[PDB]
Design an enzyme around this catalytic site. Sequence first.
Site: not given
Ligand SMILES: CC[C@@H](CO)Nc1ncc(C)c(-c2c[nH]c(C(=O)N[C@H](CO)c3cccc(Cl)c3)c2)n1
Length: 332
Positions: A23, A27, A31, A46, A141
Amino acid sequence: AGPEMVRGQVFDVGPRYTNLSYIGEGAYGMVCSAYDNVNKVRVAIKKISPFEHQTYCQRTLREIKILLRFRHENIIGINDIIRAPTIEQMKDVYIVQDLMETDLYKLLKTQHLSNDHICYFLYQILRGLKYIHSANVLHRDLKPSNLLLNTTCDLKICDFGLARVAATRWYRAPEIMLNYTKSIDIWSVGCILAEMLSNRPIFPGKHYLDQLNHILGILGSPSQEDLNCIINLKARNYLLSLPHKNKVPWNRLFPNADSKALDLLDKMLTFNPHKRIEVEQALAHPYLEQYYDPSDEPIAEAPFKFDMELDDLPKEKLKELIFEETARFQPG
Ligand SMILES: CC[C@@H](CO)Nc1ncc(C)c(-c2c[nH]c(C(=O)N[C@H](CO)c3cccc(Cl)c3)c2)n1
């Protein structure tokens, strides 16, 4: 069967979390969406691999400590944390969070927002930011990809990696490039408001120099007071060497936008951070009148403070603190 793998990256989260699907990414991690056989719902996991770098270890510990302390409707929380049973084996940390349907980046790519939807999304960002700022914390951010949305248009702020106690270029405040404070988050909210009004970024700079030109191209040339600050010599001499740029009126850049929406946008997208509107004055603005409710706008009980200076600690000590912080989520 063994552990599950998604696009090369292993995901040792089972047997509780199965049926994994990609999803998003960051960096130093990935996720994934996964099925929780305990709560009988799909969750977001994550995965982060930060132990190779000292900066990544600081971000991981700050993100975990902030989100576990924080409890707000418009902020993402931590439900569970998975990592190896011994410190020597721990190479990854899996943060389990509530799964959301989409985000504002994905929504603005395909959908045109009505003024009421722009008004309700902005309110929830500022309601969530009011709680973050009351805790003396900066997100640093804020962008449409870090603003999660569900079926019933409920908004949640995510990614507290760059968060600190008081970034993406397009939503970066001029003072970060010129020379941090609560005002840098308001600038980003302004950039998000302008993007909801036109489905296009207001300052899509290709580099730190082109970014400043895009801001000056709309706000006009900076005044003597706007430049009279602790600015770096290179950036100061560059802005002074540029030709005069006229201020483009907000009603000209967004012809069919609400006049109240553009009045708040002006106050949020102010070059001088001292003259820039704060989160409370932004919520009390007439544009968010039908949603503003000081009764149902909670704040943090006490300001956030770290027990030790994390910048001075090596990656080995930070790994130990991460292991100790995630211990309460282990069986026994
Ligand atoms: C299925 C739809 C997605 C969003 O478009 N849903 C969703 N639902 C819950 C969550 C918690 C998230 C979510 C979106 N970004 C992130 C998230 O934590 N993103 C950061 C980068 O912006 C990240 C990711 C992986 C590693 C690092 Cl170092 C950092 C979580 N995304």
